[PDB]
């Protein structure tokens with residue numbers, strides 16, 4: 001297929017461990033972004049076939065989306081909050097490097113990123 005396998009979302013041999021920051025990332029950050037009116041293009045991996053983006057996975061080396069992040073948080077896949085923050089950053093970077101500035105998708109990403117950064121400003125210690 002034009003599309004890669006989706007990113008892994010479970011780690012069967014990793015111990016389960018919560019942190020205050022991981023709780024915040026799921027229950028505050030992800031939840032707020034997931035419900036936002038602009039979330040829909042970011043709730044699942046980019047399907048380059050259906051969206052007619054034949055060069056997407058040539059350009060984007062590290063695919064990322066909020067459906068993957070959500071499942072990773074729910075499955076306790078991340079060892080620490082910084083790994084999760086990096087996935088959010090990667091998802092936004094992918095959007096900004098692939099799509100033309102001023103494309104609707106870019107303005108949506110920017111609105112979501114602004115909300116993300118505001119919540120990250122209040123990340124627990």
Ligand SMILES: Cn1cc(-c2ccc3cc(C(=O)Nc4ccccc4N)ccc3n2)c2cc[nH]c2c1=O
Nearest residue numbers: 040041042045046047051053094095096098099105
């Ligand atoms: C991250 N990302 C994501 C997308 C992405 C993903 C999911 C999409 C889904 C629809 C869709 O179902 N539209 C629809 C159909 C019927 C009724 C109402 C609506 N809104 C339309 C466009 C989509 N574009 C994208 C496209 C170019 N570049 C990117 C890009 O970088």
